[PDB]
Symmetry: C3
């Protein structure tokens, strides 16, 4: 009784297992912009996915952040550090990575809870 | 007498915690072939591992795919995109990475359910 | 409800969801040391975090290991092999990665169980 969302042959965007939510690699739908813009797009899409299963921004457990360029780290954090409800930031791990599309400045992978 | 010198690797292959399955990084047993062959080997090993604990290919939650070479992306997907039952692909995040053994074309890290 | 530990705007060091423990990216507090030193520092901080919630190093489920330099692989594994009770080491996946601070030789990301009522 795994529930899946936005499913194609290649992937589900999201899978729910009991009360645990898995969200696969998230990138900006419009990767033409800067790190701040792409970060915001990804976080907003995460908001939308979470709301669709009865979760929310305060229920995130872990985020893996794959960052394309070191120079973008401050801009990533500018958006991220203002985002989560007070005292409810998830665990986080950010490193540099080579992503499939050279336009992507960042990719996130998420585990969350659903009450 | 005889003295034996070996390289011995004792791998934590899987850990089960209630109804969630964590699989250690998986690579091809025989990494001499192309991306298609290596991808097939790893997915087949995942079938065997999941079978052994009462899970299956339709119960995968997340797969992190670490691809060694950009040129192998299409070949990875050629196999992957035909693998999963309809509506049952896991969440996925693929990026390029330098792997421990230069022979490996891909490594996969799996979380699955056993219901 | 989720319980979080060592929380700032940027991150919680640890989040507990029922009996599953998530610990975020762990790097050495003092990164001037070699791979063995940094690996020990990281595993000790993981130990402290786990025990604070009633888990322990025999209850880890997965560790993602991001290694900065190929020549450090043997040193990482030397400590790893000295650390965990026989047969109870967690699943792992190690690859080479560029980390944010060039001084960091390794970074680990952890999922663990919190089973029993073990006091530390």
């Amino acid at each position: 009784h795994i529930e899946r969302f936005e499913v194609v042959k290649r992937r589900a965007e999201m899978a729910l297992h009991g009360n645990t939510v898995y969200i696969g690699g998230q990138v900006a739908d419009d990767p033409s912009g800067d790190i701040q813009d792409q970060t915001r797009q990804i976080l907003e899409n995460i908001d939308r996915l979470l709301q669709s299963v009865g979760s929310d921004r305060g229920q995130v457990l872990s985020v893996r952040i794959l960052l394309a360029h070191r120079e973008d780290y401050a801009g990533l954090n500018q958006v991220w550090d203002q985002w989560f409800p007070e005292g409810r930031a998830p665990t986080r791990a950010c490193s540099l990575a080579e992503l499939i599309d050279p336009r992507w400045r960042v990719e996130m992978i998420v585990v969350a809870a659903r009450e």
